Amino acid sequence: DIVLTQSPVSLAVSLGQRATISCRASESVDFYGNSFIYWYQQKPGQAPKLLIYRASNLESGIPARFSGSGSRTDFTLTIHPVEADDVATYYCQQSIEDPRTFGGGTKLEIKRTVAAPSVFIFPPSDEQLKSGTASVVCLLNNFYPREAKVQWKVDNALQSGNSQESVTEQDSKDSTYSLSSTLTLSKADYEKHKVYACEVTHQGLSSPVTKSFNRGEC
Amino acid sequence: TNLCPFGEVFNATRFASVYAWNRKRISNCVADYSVLYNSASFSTFKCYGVSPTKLNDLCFTNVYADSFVIRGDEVRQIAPGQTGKIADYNYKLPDDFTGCVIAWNSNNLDSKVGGNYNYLYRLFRKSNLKPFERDISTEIYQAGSTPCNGVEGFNCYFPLQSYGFQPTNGVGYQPYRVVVLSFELLHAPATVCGPK
Amino acid sequence: QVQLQQPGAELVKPGASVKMSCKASGYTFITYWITWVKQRPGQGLEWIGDIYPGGGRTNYNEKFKSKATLTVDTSSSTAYMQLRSLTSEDSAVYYCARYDGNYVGYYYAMDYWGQGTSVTVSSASTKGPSVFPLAPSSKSTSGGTAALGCLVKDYFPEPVTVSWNSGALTSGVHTFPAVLQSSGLYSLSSVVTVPSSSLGTQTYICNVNHKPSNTKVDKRVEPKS
Ligand SMILES: *[C@@H]1O[C@H](CO)[C@@H](O[C@@H]2O[C@H](CO)[C@@H](O[C@@H]3O[C@H](CO[C@H]4O[C@H](CO)[C@@H](O)[C@H](O[C@H]5O[C@H](CO)[C@@H](O)[C@H](O)[C@@H]5O)[C@@H]4O)[C@@H](O)[C@H](O)[C@@H]3O)[C@H](O)[C@H]2NC(C)=O)[C@H](O)[C@H]1NC(C)=O
């Protein structure tokens, strides 16, 4: 079984710059002048899309910004110029022998200018409190880079261990991320405290930003 | 140097009509597929039950090389499970076919200025061919209740029809030479092998 | 218009079997190979096997010959993969795709793909979501815009889909990936940033669809009080 190894595992590139992704084969994939290597692009939630076949031949409809090269064990997919909608994972495939195998993938991220999150906090709805659970939500909208710190504070005490974060994929047009942080409490515990706050630290903010409410709209 | 005689099949000066397709039995030789891999002529090179890249590593009890001429938009019918005039009435591959289909455009050899009409196919038949059946009958086809008595007429048609291969025709109606390599594995010892 | 269509998701009990379809259209089904590929969440692709629809010759990855069986129905232009004795390791997205097999052309290149069938192997029961409003705040123009949303909670299995205003509101919508809670149920939020002024003038309705439980919730989201 031929093993294909892709490096880098992840890659960040600015718009207009060059991205080079490498595929290394545990055995030669060259057969009578042909390199049986294929490249695919997979955006999140979608089927992979064919880019390159026979290591250098562009599939029709694919922009010439994509190019394939290499021979024997080492192959490369090059994206120049990189654009915003190139956010995806890229896979190589060999078909010189069965089983046909794929590389582990290279995830491409777009480097853009720093952008601070817009921060919003949402109290639990009254409907949810009827069920006995309270979810408090903190939203960080349209920020870059990905690193951000969300700290929950209840009656000014930092809370850890009862919150969960989810992040969107890098937006295909503006290259930002958005993030939700959800703090989960029993109804009783929610009703024992007054001030609910989330504090966001991010490179785009000159100092941390805090959004808060008082339970019961006090 | 006992190379399998692929050149005799692929490079034969004359090719057969598809209804009278030729078959060459191949045995007791080393098959050098390099000559096929290094050819730039082939527009179709499709294998079934075997991999094209793995041919030089495999051994077979017998090889049959079948060859004929059809038009280009019919090469798709030379494959397992196909339907149409060629697959049903002229040349039929079984579902479990093991081998390769190779085709290349032969307009420079098999067309001529007034049209080449020497290549023919069977147009009418009472039943479908069985796999690898070769039917060379010229018997008048009875399309109706009226017997034909060996004579063409209203519901009585000659069963063969000529291709008209005009040099200026589009590629869909240009002649393509086809070779079908079938690889049979029996329990008997093998006689044909590529350079292992 | 070459098209390969697969059902979106399946929930199947462990140790049971599942049969998935791949409906082909826009080309001659019996002249292209159909291949099947496995993608476990967050991982790469793994080849399962191939079938030639004319006559049904199959080729299997040795890893999957006990797990998978490939068939076709040529009259309906549909290919099928059956997976047997399912475990949690078989929870994954399964893709069908086509290739032409021509050594002097595209060869094994997968030019057209189905969009995948996401298989969840679990014994848990199907549960439709509860949809709660994330109400816009009375304080105005933080970040220059207001934000509002829907919290979609306590549903199983994935997926849920959310749209806003029946698909008329698409700008500024962010639908987060679902998180698996310790309860074994999924939770998700969908948010949209809108003009703070439009809070009075415009109605915002999130449309939540949970096909596995045949549930559709349209929840209006309003400022509190
Ligand atoms: C039908 O007829 C036509 C016309 O007569 C035939 O077409 C000719 O076919 C031959 C090939 O059979 C072509 O010519 C040569 O191909 C040779 C193959 O090269 C390999 O073997 C050589 C000796 O072992 C060697 O020199 C060569 O080295 C290369 O590969 C090595 C390994 O990859 C590498 O290390 C070397 O550096 C080098 O790159 C190969 O191993 C070759 O000797 C010649 O140079 C030439 O390429 C003709 O060009 C064809 N002519 C035409 C007009 O098409 C056709 O084959 C016939 N068909 C059949 C089925 O018989």
Residue numbers in the entry:
A (entry chain L): 1 to 31, 34 to 57, 65 to 72, 74 to 80, 83 to 109, 114 to 234
B (entry chain A): 333 to 528
C (entry chain H): 1 to 9, 11 to 30, 35 to 59, 62 to 72, 74 to 111, 111A, 112B, 112A, ...
From the paper:
M8a-34 also bound and neutralized most sarbecoviruses across different clades and SARS-CoV-2 variants and exhibited a similar competition as M8a-3 and M8a-31. To map its epitope, we determined a cryo-EM structure of M8a-34 Fab bound to the WA1 spike trimer at 3.5 Å resolution, revealing interactions of three Fabs with three “up” RBDs that were modeled using an M8a-34 Fab-RBD crystal structure. M8a-34 Fab interacted with the RBD through all three CDRHs as well as CDRL1 and CDRL3. The M8a-34 epitope was similar to epitopes of other class 1/4 mAbs including M8a-3, M8a-6, and M8a-31, which overlapped with the binding epitopes of CR3022 (class 4) and C118 (class 1/4), again consistent with its binding and neutralizing properties and competition ELISA results. M8a-31 and M8a-34 recognized all RBDs in the ELISA panel. M8a-31 and M8a-34 were less potent against SARS-CoV-2 variants but were more broadly cross-reactive, correlating with ELISA profiles. M8a-34 and HSW-1 both had long CDRH3s (16 residues), and M8a-31 had the shortest CDRH3 (9 residues).
Here, we identified monoclonal antibodies (mAbs) capable of cross-reactive binding and neutralization of animal sarbecoviruses and SARS-CoV-2 variants by screening single mouse B cells secreting IgGs that bind two or more sarbecovirus RBDs. To deduce recognition and neutralization mechanisms, we used single-particle cryo-EM to solve structures of Fabs from the seven cross-reactive mAbs complexed with a SARS-CoV-2 6P spike trimer. Here, we characterized mouse mAbs elicited by mosaic (M8a mAbs) or homotypic (HSW mAbs) RBD-nanoparticles using both structural and functional analyses, showing that mosaic nanoparticles induce potently neutralizing antibodies that cross-react between animal sarbecoviruses and SARS-CoV-2 VOCs. Structural analyses revealed neutralization mechanisms, potentials for intra-spike trimer cross-linking by IgGs, and induced changes in trimer upon Fab binding.
